[PDB]
Amino acid sequence: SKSMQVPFSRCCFSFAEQEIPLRAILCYRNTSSICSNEGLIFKLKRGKEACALDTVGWVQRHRKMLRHCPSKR
Amino acid sequence: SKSMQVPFSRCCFSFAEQEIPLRAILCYRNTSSICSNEGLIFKLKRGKEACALDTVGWVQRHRKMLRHCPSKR
Ligand SMILES: *[C@@H]1O[C@H](CO)[C@@H](O)[C@H](O)[C@H]1NC(C)=O
Ligand SMILES: *[C@@H]1O[C@H](CO)[C@@H](O)[C@H](O)[C@H]1NC(C)=O
Numbered sequence: 431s432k433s434m435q436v437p438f439s440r441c442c443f444s445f446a447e448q449e450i451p452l453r454a455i456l457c458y459r460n461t462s463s464i465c466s467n468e469g470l471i472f473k474l475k476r477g478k479e480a481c482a483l484d485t486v487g488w489v490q491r492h493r494k495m496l497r498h499c500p501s502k503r
Numbered sequence: 504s505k506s507m508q509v510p511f512s513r514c515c516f517s518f519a520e521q522e523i524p525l526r527a528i529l530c531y532r533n534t535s536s537i538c539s540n541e542g543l544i545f546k547l548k549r550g551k552e553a554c555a556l557d558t559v560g561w562v563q564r565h566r567k568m569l570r571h572c573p574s575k576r
Contacts, residue, residue: 434523435551438544439514443537450507464516465538471511477575478508502550 442469442481449488450480457499473499515542515554522561523553530572546572
């Protein structure tokens with residue numbers, strides 16, 4: 431287990447205004463706890479991503495319909 | 504070009520204390536301009552990464568010896 435690592439944080443400072451369709455989303459990532467701010471990250475198709483604010487209804491409803499994104503190692 | 508996207512920011516709030524060997528690094532990523540803080544991200548082997556503070560000598564010397572990380576699309 432190679433760990434010279436001090437990872438970067440994934441933060442959401444700007445958020446999706448327009449509702450993203452559920453069909454367009456693969457999974458979600460939670461933002462880093464240091465810069466949390468109730469943001470969520472939806473993994474879209476072809477490598478794309480979108481920050482979404484979890485205090486908004488459609489974000490909560492979508493989050494409840496998707497699993498957390500998996501990671502490599 | 505699918506863009507429903509509002510990307511997350513890559514930030515560096517904690518930094519590498521111990522110097523990472525140049526041989527262990529593939530390239531570097533600059534942090535997002537919103538949360539810049541003079542941090543740098545070094546891409547390590549087997550998917551790993553490390554935040555490094557660009558006001559420190561070894562970080563500046565290493566940065567000058569590596570190219571910027573490429574991206575998919
Ligand atoms: C995701 O955010 C929720 C709050 O909405 C929190 O309870 C949880 O610990 C976070 N999970 C991860 C895996 O970061
Ligand atoms: C990287 O940081 C330098 C300052 O050290 C800045 O001049 C530059 O605009 C940044 N480049 C990118 C590609 O983010």
